[PDB]
Design a protein around this motif. Structure first.
Motif, PDB file in Angstrom:
ATOM      1  N   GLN B 117       4.246  18.558 -32.078  1.00 38.37           N
ATOM      2  CA  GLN B 117       4.682  19.845 -32.612  1.00 38.37           C
ATOM      3  C   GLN B 117       6.204  19.965 -32.589  1.00 38.37           C
ATOM      4  N   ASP B 118       6.868  18.919 -32.108  1.00 40.06           N
ATOM      5  CA  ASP B 118       8.324  18.905 -32.031  1.00 40.06           C
ATOM      6  C   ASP B 118       8.905  17.717 -32.795  1.00 40.06           C
ATOM      7  N   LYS B 119       9.480  16.772 -32.061  1.00 39.34           N
ATOM      8  CA  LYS B 119      10.074  15.588 -32.668  1.00 39.34           C
ATOM      9  C   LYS B 119       9.448  14.312 -32.117  1.00 39.34           C
ATOM     10  N   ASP B 120       8.919  14.397 -30.901  1.00 40.25           N
ATOM     11  CA  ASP B 120       8.288  13.250 -30.258  1.00 40.25           C
ATOM     12  C   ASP B 120       7.014  12.843 -30.991  1.00 40.25           C
ATOM     13  N   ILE B 121       5.992  13.688 -30.909  1.00 37.46           N
ATOM     14  CA  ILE B 121       4.719  13.419 -31.563  1.00 37.46           C
ATOM     15  C   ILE B 121       4.922  13.038 -33.026  1.00 37.46           C
ATOM     16  N   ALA B 122       5.684  13.855 -33.744  1.00 36.05           N
ATOM     17  CA  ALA B 122       5.959  13.604 -35.155  1.00 36.05           C
ATOM     18  C   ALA B 122       6.148  12.112 -35.422  1.00 36.05           C
ATOM     19  N   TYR B 125       2.837   9.851 -34.598  1.00 37.69           N
ATOM     20  CA  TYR B 125       1.810   9.690 -35.619  1.00 37.69           C
ATOM     21  C   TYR B 125       2.328   8.881 -36.804  1.00 37.69           C
ATOM     22  N   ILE B 126       2.876   7.708 -36.517  1.00 35.60           N
ATOM     23  CA  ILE B 126       3.415   6.836 -37.557  1.00 35.60           C
ATOM     24  C   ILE B 126       3.189   5.364 -37.217  1.00 35.60           C
ATOM     25  N   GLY B 127       2.257   5.110 -36.303  1.00 34.30           N
ATOM     26  CA  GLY B 127       1.945   3.754 -35.890  1.00 34.30           C
ATOM     27  C   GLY B 127       0.810   3.151 -36.690  1.00 34.30           C
ATOM     28  N   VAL B 135       3.585  -1.258 -29.244  1.00 32.93           N
ATOM     29  CA  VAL B 135       3.341  -1.232 -27.807  1.00 32.93           C
ATOM     30  C   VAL B 135       4.544  -0.670 -27.054  1.00 32.93           C
ATOM     31  N   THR B 136       4.848   0.600 -27.299  1.00 32.72           N
ATOM     32  CA  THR B 136       4.075   1.406 -28.234  1.00 32.72           C
ATOM     33  C   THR B 136       4.902   2.569 -28.778  1.00 32.72           C
ATOM     34  N   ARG B 137       5.301   3.472 -27.887  1.00 31.40           N
ATOM     35  CA  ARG B 137       6.095   4.631 -28.274  1.00 31.40           C
ATOM     36  C   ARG B 137       7.487   4.218 -28.739  1.00 31.40           C
ATOM     37  N   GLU B 138       8.423   4.149 -27.798  1.00 35.33           N
ATOM     38  CA  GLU B 138       9.794   3.768 -28.110  1.00 35.33           C
ATOM     39  C   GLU B 138       9.868   2.987 -29.417  1.00 35.33           C
ATOM     40  N   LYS B 139       9.127   1.885 -29.484  1.00 36.27           N
ATOM     41  CA  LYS B 139       9.107   1.049 -30.678  1.00 36.27           C
ATOM     42  C   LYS B 139       8.739   1.862 -31.915  1.00 36.27           C
ATOM     43  N   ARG B 140       7.643   2.604 -31.822  1.00 38.13           N
ATOM     44  CA  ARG B 140       7.180   3.430 -32.934  1.00 38.13           C
ATOM     45  C   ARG B 140       8.289   4.347 -33.434  1.00 38.13           C
ATOM     46  N   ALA B 144      10.083   4.702 -37.230  1.00 35.69           N
ATOM     47  CA  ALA B 144      10.114   5.964 -37.957  1.00 35.69           C
ATOM     48  C   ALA B 144      11.505   6.243 -38.512  1.00 35.69           C
ATOM     49  N   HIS B 145      12.517   6.064 -37.670  1.00 29.90           N
ATOM     50  CA  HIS B 145      13.900   6.284 -38.079  1.00 29.90           C
ATOM     51  C   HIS B 145      14.296   5.334 -39.203  1.00 29.90           C
ATOM     52  N   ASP B 146      13.857   4.083 -39.094  1.00 30.85           N
ATOM     53  CA  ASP B 146      14.158   3.067 -40.115  1.00 30.85           C
ATOM     54  C   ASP B 146      13.619   3.515 -41.474  1.00 30.85           C
ATOM     55  N   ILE B 147      12.381   3.966 -41.439  1.00 30.75           N
ATOM     56  CA  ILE B 147      11.669   4.445 -42.633  1.00 30.75           C
ATOM     57  C   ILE B 147      12.447   5.594 -43.279  1.00 30.75           C
ATOM     58  N   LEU B 148      12.873   6.544 -42.455  1.00 32.81           N
ATOM     59  CA  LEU B 148      13.625   7.699 -42.941  1.00 32.81           C
ATOM     60  C   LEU B 148      14.951   7.273 -43.562  1.00 32.81           C
TER      61      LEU B 148
END
Lengths: 83, 290, 206, 207, 258
Positions: B117-122, B125-127, B135-140, B144-148
């Motif tokens: 509901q903020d910036k973390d989860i957002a 949900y892109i893995g 594996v898992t978060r940090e990387k994900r 996401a930033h690369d994609i943007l």
């Protein structure tokens, strides 16, 4: 499984069919073309078929037709019989 | 040989284009734009809407954001740029008053972000690329930033500090959609032409050249590895294969292929036709085909 | 112009596609020597040769005079009596009889019993149309025929009402297409030509 | 308002009519019953309240062959083991060849198999309401079919030397099958208002 | 026209503008937003059971604007429109309409229960709503009026039909006829018109299910003529005849796909 039918109790049409004429004349053609006993005074033709037609007109040509029924039975007709 | 034009898309639209009604979706917004900088142009967009199943739910809108992976409700992406707080998000789409009608349709849209509901989860949900990784978060988050910055609306700007610019466009995109379901205008016309562009012998010889040089920098790169190991000495015109594009254009222009005799099988037929010099008149009508 | 210019590009292919469809489902059928059309497997699809029993290719749409007629004028074309009539005797030439003994008076009302069971049915079967395609143009075999023999009103008929009625009965029963009898198998035939028949009692009634 | 009452009066133009047709015996009185002549024979409180004993029987004229049929409504909607197996003893008491039971709407699977199972030679057919309550038999597009005695059946297979399979079939689920009550194997002659030239006769069996 | 407007979907097509949700506490709450209100007060004044075995419950007022755009073309009163609603929802709703003397013609539809047993399979906490929107789906889709479920809009065109006379001659009885616009039949001859002996359709699929199999053959023959005849077209009854018999010669409708 044939059955054969009575040369006395024939069912089918007494007349000779569009297709038959075409097959008979086709058949005697090959026959005569193959040096065969020609059954009518040679008018002086050359064409193994135009000759066969001379025969047909005079109904003086051998060959008979076995007409297979759906049953599996058949009928035999003589060129001189047909119409 | 004579190269021959072609008419694919247009890009940079700004193009309604709907459909119906197998049916699955209901109202699309294709964009497929991408620099454009002088060659590259791989990428797309598209976003859905849905309005079926009178049982589920209230007509809700989503997105795709190539090239991976599924469907991603809209609020999720605004919350991934710099606008998490509600209200402000709608400001980019519609403008009250308002006109709740056009907005209302949001209700079902927002509900999809009732968990963000903020910036973390957002970014979470892109893995889903992919070929099994992470594996898992940090990387994900990094992905996401690369994609943007390359995938999410690749034109505009590919720098870093420019996520507030891509925040309106989406609002603009979906502004158009709303105008059609509410029946306020009409679905853009794909007939143009007026909107399609002809790729002459230029932009055509672009995408090829590029598709033969990037192998240069690869074939040579491997040579360095073999040199640094067991060899060395440094470098020199010892590599730089000669038969790389010289022969690699002969049988790529000569035929309708774009990278032969490589594996590139189904690679759109040329576009390369022999001249056709029957009558002078003809010759000319050939140097003007597409 | 460029629309009927692509709509002509289609009929060039599609038309062909639909063609093969039918063929690939009808090759199966053909007319067996029994007087019936049957499947590959023998599964029979028609009991006639086309319900009619005749070869499409030898047929000419024809007209039923006896249909769209007022009963009032119907009687003024076929019916005959001795009631203040006897106008035919002016044609019976040469030879009247005259009237001989019964029989004739009786044939005349028996002909119309059936020429009349035909006026009511049809209709009861056909909407209103009259033009239908039958085998053998009859309306023509009579002209030309009044060319071959001529003879005008001035020459009255050397015929006999007791002949034309036999004429038919003997030469409708010569129109057989299902053989033979084989009782009851004469039924499929009696009404596999029933339509063609009501013609011959309408253009040759007395 | 009392629309669902009048709507059944037509279930006797779809029933007593359904007889011959077959070959049973029904009174030409029960075929010319007007809107009110129907309410006449049936005495219902109103107004409304109808039901009662809606459903009688009839006899045939074909003498032998046996036996007889029983028309019987419901009139209880949705049926129904609590109205099926319980309404068969009755069918076994007066002794009948077979009969009919109607309903609306839908019928449960349970009460469909536990019947035609010990029935033996007899039979349960078949119809319902809000469906076949108007004789389709009377339709421009529907030619009159007539039944064929087993004797006449053997005729075709000779005159045309065929197999009980090589003929034109008819699905059971055909409102004209159900109507005349064809069973799998019988053979139905139909006289087509063809052209054709003529009045062409076609034949069909069941499957 | 008795029939023209006696076999149409109908349902909630006169409202189309529409459904509004107002929250009104006491059974005597309103506002507007227009006039009305007065009518509601008159209905309550007649206190003929107001209290009833229950009491004052139904904090979910819902309103309905019935367009006089379809009130004229289709003979519909206001006591009928809301006279058959509660014939499929028990008493869960209480309708109160007005006379034709109104300028908007509106009708209310409340909801009462509590203290109801409540339940079951599936809880509902936050907040009295969803369960509502769902009900609408059924309301707007059910369903009074000679609406032959599925049968959309209909038309009427003069069909030059030829008849016979006691005279002998035939005449062109220019009679009217309705042209459906989609399935289905069956519940279509149950009508008062109608006409059973002659009703026709374009879906053989259905004609086989509801007429004869022989019937359906004639249907093909006819439906193929109407494909290649208009206009001036090479017709032979023979070959047309054959295609049909092949289709309907094994019972089911054997299609002829590529």
């Amino acid at each position: 499984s044939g059955k054969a039918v009575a040369k006395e109790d024939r069912t089918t049409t007494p007349y000779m069919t569009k297709y038959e004429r075409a097959r008979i004349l086709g058949t005697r053609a090959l026959q005569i073309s193959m040096n065969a006993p020609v059954l009518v005074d040679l008018e002086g033709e050359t064409d193994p078929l135009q000759i066969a037609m001379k025969e047909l007109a005079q109904k003086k040509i051998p060959l008979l037709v076995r007409r297979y029924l759906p049953d599996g039975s058949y009928e035999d007709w003589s060129v001189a019989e047909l119409i | 040989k004579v190269i021959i034009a072609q008419e694919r898309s247009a890009a940079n639209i700004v193009q309604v284009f709907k459909k119906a009604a197998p049916s699955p979706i209901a109202y699309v917004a294709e964009i497929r734009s991408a620099l454009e900088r002088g060659s590259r142009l791989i990428s797309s967009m598209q976003i859905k809407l849905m309005a079926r199943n009178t049982e589920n739910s209230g007509q809700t809108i989503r997105a795709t954001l190539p090239y991976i992976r599924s469907d991603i409700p809209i609020v999720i992406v605004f919350r991934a740029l710099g606008v998490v707080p509600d209200r402000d998000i709608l400001e980019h789409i519609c403008y009250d008053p308002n006109d709740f009608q056009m907005l209302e349709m949001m209700k079902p849209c927002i509900e999809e972000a009732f968990v963000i509901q903020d910036k973390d989860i957002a970014l979470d949900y892109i893995g889903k690329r992919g070929s099994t990784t992470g594996v898992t978060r940090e990387k994900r988050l990094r992905y996401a930033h690369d994609i943007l910055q390359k995938e999410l609306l690749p034109h505009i700007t590919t720098m870093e500090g420019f996520e507030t610019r891509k925040a309106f466009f989406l609002g603009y995109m979906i502004h158009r959609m709303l105008l059609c379901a509410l029946e306020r205008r009409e679905p853009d016309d794909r007939d143009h032409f007026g909107k399609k562009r002809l790729d002459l012998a230029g932009p055509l010889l672009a995408s090829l050249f590029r598709m033969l040089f990037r192998k240069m920098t690869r074939d040579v790169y491997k040579y360095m590895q073999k040199c640094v190991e067991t060899n060395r000495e440094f470098n020199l015109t010892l590599a730089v294969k000669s038969n790389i594009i010289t022969n690699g254009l002969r049988y790529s222009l000569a035929t309708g292929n774009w990278g032969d005799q490589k594996r590139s099988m189904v690679n759109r037929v040329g576009v390369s036709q022999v001249l056709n010099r029957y009558t002078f008149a003809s010759t000319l009508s050939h140097l003007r085909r597409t | 112009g460029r629309e009927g210019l692509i709509d002509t590009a289609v009929k060039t292919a599609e038309t062909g596609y639909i063609q093969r469809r039918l063929v690939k489902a009808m090759e199966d059928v053909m007319v067996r020597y029994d007087g019936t059309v049957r499947n590959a497997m023998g599964d029979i699809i028609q009991f006639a040769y086309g319900e009619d029993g005749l070869d499409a290719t030898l047929v000419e749409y024809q007209v039923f005079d006896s249909l769209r007629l007022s009963t009032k004028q119907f009687e003024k074309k076929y019916r005959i009596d001795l009631m203040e009539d006897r106008s035919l005797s002016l044609y019976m030439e040469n030879s009247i009889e005259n009237d001989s003994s019964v029989q004739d008076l009786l044939d005349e009302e028996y002909t119309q019993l059936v020429a009349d069971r035909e006026l009511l049915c049809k209709f009861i079967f056909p909407k209103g149309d009259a033009r239908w395609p039958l085998p053998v143009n009859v309306q023509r075999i009579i002209q030309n025929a009044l060319q071959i023999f001529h003879l005008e009103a001035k020459k009255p008929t050397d015929l006999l009402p007791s002949d034309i009625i036999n004429g038919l009965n003997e030469l409708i029963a010569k129109l057989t297409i299902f053989r033979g009898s084989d009782r009851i198998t004469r039924d499929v035939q009696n009404n596999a030509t029933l339509l063609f028949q009501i013609l011959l009692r309408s253009k040759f009634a007395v | 308002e009392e629309k669902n009452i009048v709507r059944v009066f037509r279930a006797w133009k779809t029933a007593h009519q359904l007889v011959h047709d077959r070959g049973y015996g029904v009174s030409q009185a029960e075929l010319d019953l007007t809107l009110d002549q129907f309410k006449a024979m049936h005495c219902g409180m109103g107004r409304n309240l109808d039901r009662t004993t809606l459903s009688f029987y009839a006899k045939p004229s074909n003498d032998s062959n046996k036996g007889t049929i029983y028309i019987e409504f419901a009139k209880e909607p949705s049926v129904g083991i609590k109205e099926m197996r319980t309404f068969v003893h009755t069918l076994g008491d007066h002794n009948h060849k077979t009969g009919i039971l109607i309903y609306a709407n839908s019928m449960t699977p349970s009460a469909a198999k536990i019947i035609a199972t010990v029935t033996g030679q007899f039979t349960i057919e078949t119809f319902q309401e809000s469906d076949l309550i108007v004789n389709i038999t009377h339709h421009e597009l529907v030619p009159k079919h007539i039944l064929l005695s087993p004797d006449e059946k053997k005729e075709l297979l000779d005159r045309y030397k065929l197999r009980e399979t090589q003929l034109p079939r008819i699905q059971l689920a055909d409102p004209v099958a159900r109507y005349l009550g064809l069973k799998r194997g019988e053979v139905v002659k139909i006289v087509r208002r063809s052209e054709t030239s003529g009045r062409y006769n076609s034949y069909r069996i069941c499957a | 026209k008795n029939v023209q407007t006696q076999i149409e979907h109908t349902t909630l097509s006169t409202v189309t503008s529409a459904t509004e949700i107002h929250y009104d506490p006491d059974p005597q709450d309103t506002v507007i937003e227009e006039d009305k209100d007065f009518v509601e007060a008159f209905f309550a004044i007649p206190d003929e059971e107001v209290e009833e075995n229950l009491y004052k419950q139904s904090p979910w007022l819902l309103r309905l604007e019935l367009d006089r755009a379809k009130m004229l073309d289709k003979k519909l009163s206001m006591s009928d429109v809301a006279g058959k609603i509660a014939e499929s929802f028990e008493r869960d709703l209480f309708t109160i309409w007005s006379e034709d003397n109104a300028d908007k013609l509106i009708i209310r539809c409340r909801i009462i229960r509590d203290d109801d047993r409540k339940a079951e399979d599936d809880d509902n906490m936050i907040e009295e709503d969803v369960f509502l929107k769902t009900i609408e789906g059924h309301m707007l889709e059910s369903i009074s009026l000679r609406g032959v479920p599925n049968i959309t809009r209909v038309y009427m065109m003069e069909h030059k039909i030829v008849r016979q006379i006691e005279d002998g001659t035939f005449e062109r009885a220019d009679e009217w006829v309705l042209e459906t616009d989609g399935i289905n039949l069956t519940e279509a001859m149950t009508v008062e018109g109608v006409d059973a002996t002659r009703t026709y359709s374009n879906s053989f699929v259905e004609i086989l299910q509801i007429l004869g199999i022989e019937a359906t053959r004639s249907a093909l023959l006819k439906e193929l003529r109407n494909v290649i005849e208009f206009d001036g077209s090479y017709v032979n009854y023979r070959h047309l005849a054959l295609l049909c018999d092949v289709m309907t010669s094994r019972g089911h409708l054997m299609a002829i796909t590529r």
